[PDB]
Design a binder for this molecule. Sequence first.
Ligand SMILES: [Zn+2]
Lengths: 148, 8
Amino acid sequence: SVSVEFEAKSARDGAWYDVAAFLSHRLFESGDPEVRVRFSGFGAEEDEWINVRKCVRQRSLPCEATECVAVLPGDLILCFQEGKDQALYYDAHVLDAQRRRHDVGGCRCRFLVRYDHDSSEEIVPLRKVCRRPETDYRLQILHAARAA
Amino acid sequence: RTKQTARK
Ligand SMILES: [Zn+2]
């Protein structure tokens, strides 16, 4: 089997968070079902009704050191915006990549990103980047290129 | 695969 985990977008900040459980559902005549969500990092007081189609998706993947090759200009990624008073995962697009030789610490590559929600830009290391699961495809392709 | 801890 292959497990499928989810992340959901909060209406409080527009950031994405891991989902620990789905507790309930509600339906509308107009469409767009909603699901009651318990967040992995938080408790019952932070439970939220979430638009299933628009604000729930398969969990983004924290990148392995070698997986930097699967992060391309033009990609949507989930990027850790770390600041003064808060540090949250926000959708961003990769504008450019500065790819450097890896060492003992792993990936030395750097990525210029632009956050979707505020158009702000930042240079980030791989450790702040989560790639969408479909990019696994890319990796698989690369894996097929290896020697038998 | 572990994410960093979000702080609100
Ligand atoms: Zn790298």
